[PDB]
Ligand binder design. Sequence first.
Ligand SMILES: Nc1ccn([C@@H]2O[C@H](COP(=O)(O)OP(=O)(O)OP(=O)(O)O)[C@@H](O)[C@H]2O)c(=O)n1
Ligand SMILES: Nc1ccn([C@@H]2O[C@H](COP(=O)(O)OP(=O)(O)OP(=O)(O)O)[C@@H](O)[C@H]2O)c(=O)n1
Ligand SMILES: [Mg+2]
Ligand SMILES: [Mg+2]
Lengths: 222, 226
Amino acid sequence: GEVVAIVPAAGSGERLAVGVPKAFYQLDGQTLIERAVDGLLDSGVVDTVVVAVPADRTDEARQILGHRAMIVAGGSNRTDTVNLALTVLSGTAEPEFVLVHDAARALTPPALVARVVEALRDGYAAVVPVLPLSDTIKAVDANGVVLGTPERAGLRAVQTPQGFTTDLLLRSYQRGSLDEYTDDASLVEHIGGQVQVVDGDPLAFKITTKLDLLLAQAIVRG
Amino acid sequence: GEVVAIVPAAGSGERLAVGVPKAFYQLDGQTLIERAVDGLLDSGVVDTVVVAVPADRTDEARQILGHRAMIVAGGSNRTDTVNLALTVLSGTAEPEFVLVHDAARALTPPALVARVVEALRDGYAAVVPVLPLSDTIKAVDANGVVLGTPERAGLRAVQTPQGFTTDLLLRSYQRGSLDLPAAEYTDDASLVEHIGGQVQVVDGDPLAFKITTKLDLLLAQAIVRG
Ligand SMILES: Nc1ccn([C@@H]2O[C@H](COP(=O)(O)OP(=O)(O)OP(=O)(O)O)[C@@H](O)[C@H]2O)c(=O)n1
Ligand SMILES: Nc1ccn([C@@H]2O[C@H](COP(=O)(O)OP(=O)(O)OP(=O)(O)O)[C@@H](O)[C@H]2O)c(=O)n1
Ligand SMILES: [Mg+2]
Ligand SMILES: [Mg+2]
């Protein structure tokens, strides 16, 4: 059973503001996109990686990644990007599983990727890696008034790679197109698909702000 | 009107596993407890700090803090510690406002402390600093099956200092029906919400993160050196 990983890397990273689109930032000698691609490939369970990048960076992405990933242009939002990437999937020989993995989670351990794939092979149709909440979480209305504080025991913070049987992911995206989710599993939940969690890893944090970058730098050097 | 800040620092920092109770860990030459106290006082709007520490650490806390903070013995959990600290408050000269601030958020900027007090002076009865969510949140069962994904838009991550009108906070903690040894509250506002106090949000600050793990510590260190 073949496993394809789709890597959305086409966002600009406005909250990061490092002078270049985020996926192309050089973290201690190596771009975030190459790091995220290595994590996937080093897992030993990913057969093909397809990366989606800004349309004017496809050449640069190719120079960086060479043979290691197929390159396509991303879209206006992450959902668009993923839809574009899914069109690459072979008609005649479709993979058994697809992972979707944010390039922004560049320090994701390969062991986490393998754990997601192991859960898929155990028969779960949709799998997401999760961690317990760090901060208290509150529901807040539009005027900044707290509505309440959900019981945290039943809440989790969700990471990527998220993994799916191919047919389920495709159906979910096709049906979702009949209706701004940031989370692939939400689309599967929407058509009544059932999602199982596995343990994530604090190292799979999304590099979003400069403080996230500082943390990534401290991890990587030393 | 007086502002008293209470600092729960009576936790053992098991997840940090750094040799001493977390509040007493020396981050680049300063204990977290001293850094937390400094951020409150440098705000310019905190009149008095009460710090609660593990009972066997009270003398050491005083030698560290000197005149800068009043020290008391904490309790079996965060909620219990805070309740103990609240008993310290003068009844004849009650402060107008009380802040509650985790010592584990040692890099909190003084500006944040000021922003919270400013909201209380704007007439909000209770105030919490917040940040948008980083990860998607899901509700999950027993079991590990996803129950659903709440709308991210209406959710916030919440930090400290949390600020309150004194009477509201006292009534939330002296609720007779509150079983203190079994209290699993992570923050103070949820006790205020429980009795129907209205809580207002202000912008927090990424620098006010809780130092809980080695990874948090790594980040805190890179922040204080750089
Ligand atoms: N049109 C888009 C937008 C985002 N992504 C990717 O989806 C992942 C998650 O996006 P996120 O980090 O949340 O936002 P960014 O767009 O990358 O950054 P920002 O919102 O601050 O601009 C990122 O790897 C990003 O490159 C994408 O492929 N295509
Ligand atoms: N009995 C307790 C427990 C916690 N706290 C304080 O509450 C804050 C938050 O605690 P938290 O970081 O969640 O747990 P810790 O006890 O500090 O660490 P750990 O859970 O890993 O042991 C800390 O400043 C901590 O010192 C406290 O004053 N008294
Ligand atoms: Mg975005
Ligand atoms: Mg604790």
